[PDB]
Amino acid sequence: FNCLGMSNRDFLEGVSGATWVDLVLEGDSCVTIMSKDKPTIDVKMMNMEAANLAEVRSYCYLATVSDLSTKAACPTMGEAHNDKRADPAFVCRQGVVDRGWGNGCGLFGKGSIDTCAKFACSTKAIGRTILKENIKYEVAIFVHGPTTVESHGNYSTQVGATQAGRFSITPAAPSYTLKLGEYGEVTVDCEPRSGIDTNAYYVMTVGTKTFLVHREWFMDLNLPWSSAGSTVWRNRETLMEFEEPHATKQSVIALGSQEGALHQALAGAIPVEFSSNTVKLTSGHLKCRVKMEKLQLKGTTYGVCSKAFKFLGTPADTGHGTVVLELQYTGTDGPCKVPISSVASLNDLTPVGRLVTVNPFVSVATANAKVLIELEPPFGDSYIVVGRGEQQINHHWHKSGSS
Numbered sequence: 001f002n003c004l005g006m007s008n009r010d011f012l013e014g015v016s017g018a019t020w021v022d023l024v025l026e027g028d029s030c031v032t033i034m035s036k037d038k039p040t041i042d043v044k045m046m047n048m049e050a051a052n053l054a055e056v057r058s059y060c061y062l063a064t065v066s067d068l069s070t071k072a073a074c075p076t077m078g079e080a081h082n083d084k085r086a087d088p089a090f091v092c093r094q095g096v097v098d099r100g101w102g103n104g105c106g107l108f109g110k111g112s113i114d115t116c117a118k119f120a121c122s123t124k125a126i127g128r129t130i131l132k133e134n135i136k137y138e139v140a141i142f143v144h145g146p147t148t149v150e151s152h153g154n155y156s157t158q159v160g161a162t163q164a165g166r167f168s169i170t171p172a173a174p175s176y177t178l179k180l181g182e183y184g185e186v187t188v189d190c191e192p193r194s195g196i197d198t199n200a201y202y203v204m205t206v207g208t209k210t211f212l213v214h215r216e217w218f219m220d221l222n223l224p225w226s227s228a229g230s231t232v233w234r235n236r237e238t239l240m241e242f243e244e245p246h247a248t249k250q251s252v253i254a255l256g257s258q259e260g261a262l263h264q265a266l267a268g269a270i271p272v273e274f275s276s277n278t279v280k281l282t283s284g285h286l287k288c289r290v291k292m293e294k295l296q297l298k299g300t301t302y303g304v305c306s307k308a309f310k311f312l313g314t315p316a317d318t319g320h321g322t323v324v325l326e327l328q329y330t331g332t333d334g335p336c337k338v339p340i341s342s343v344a345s346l347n348d349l350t351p352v353g354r355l356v357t358v359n360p361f362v363s364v365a366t367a368n369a370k371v372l373i374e375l376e377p378p379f380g381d382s383y384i385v386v387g388r389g390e391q392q393i394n395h396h397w398h399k400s401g402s403s
């Protein structure tokens, strides 16, 4: 729910001298936003789901053929019409058979014949569309308030500390305002109608396994089908074989499962987990404007930490040109502001990078408080310095790269 630790991280600054920022979020990816006099926040794309899809087609894969009748008519007695023909559920084929003495007619010629049998669908396969209305994006936001190596990740700890927050965004409610305790609030205005069209490639469930299938291919499947809101099965003949016409009894059977031929014709297609009527999505992005007018800094009245700090390990490189490190304070002088910055040479009176953990704080009155800091040191050699004069400590950093 936090940027720290992700490869997929971006850095943004609010337009010099304005409050809001435009971004576009991407799957499993994170954005750290920095504004003069406001705390740093992280916006992150937790999850993007299409739920409650529309059922497009439906396709039968194993069928049953039942109650076979066949009406027969002697030569010159005209065309036989099996009465089962009035039945929506039955399926019928006219034919022609040699008849005569040897088999029931008083004349020799081609007698008529008409065969009906009932069609049932054992199991089926459903294709579904991803209309854009079905999309929900889930966004976490995190304020860079006092945090610890231990606690920076602990999602619960942050929520408790009025510091994290998970909300969703959908065309139904494209906007949200997350209140963040005394940090004020951040409002988000997004525009979900991004990436996916209303009618491309379908989602098709064959028994257990659900697939991302070529739309066009699904429509041409040579199987029986029922549309959206009805179980009437059209184009059934594809799964039933009508055998040789025996004068008395013609045989009508079902073809066995097609399940195998399908998992086969999809061996290569993109598999999707469709548990509980929703679909994880890996593509997709969201445009938002993130308004920070009402995001405030908190406790600027507090004094600067008067006592000595300590480094708790070599500062570590995040791999985005920023460093993370963890102080440990020694004093007990209430909560106070941490005197950390980055200077080009040790005696330097003004600083050189920027803090990412803007406005860092010892937030307790007990001894040995820890604070995590992430800062962006400048290119080349510099010292990270914490403290004033006698109690100053420091650590050197080189950052490679020119531009």
Ligand SMILES: *[C@@H]1O[C@H](CO[C@H]2O[C@@H](C)[C@@H](O)[C@@H](O)[C@@H]2O)[C@@H](O[C@@H]2O[C@H](CO)[C@@H](O)[C@H](O)[C@H]2NC(C)=O)[C@H](O)[C@H]1NC(C)=O
Binding pocket: 150, 153, 154, 155, 156, 157
């Ligand atoms: C989120 O944090 C909580 C509790 O936070 C406490 O963790 C302590 C180890 C300590 O440093 C203290 O300062 C801090 O407030 C974790 O949940 C549980 O914490 C209790 C102690 O309060 C322990 O008995 C358990 O180890 C622990 N239970 C669990 C969930 O395993 C929790 O670990 C953490 N979130 C994560 C990353 O799981």
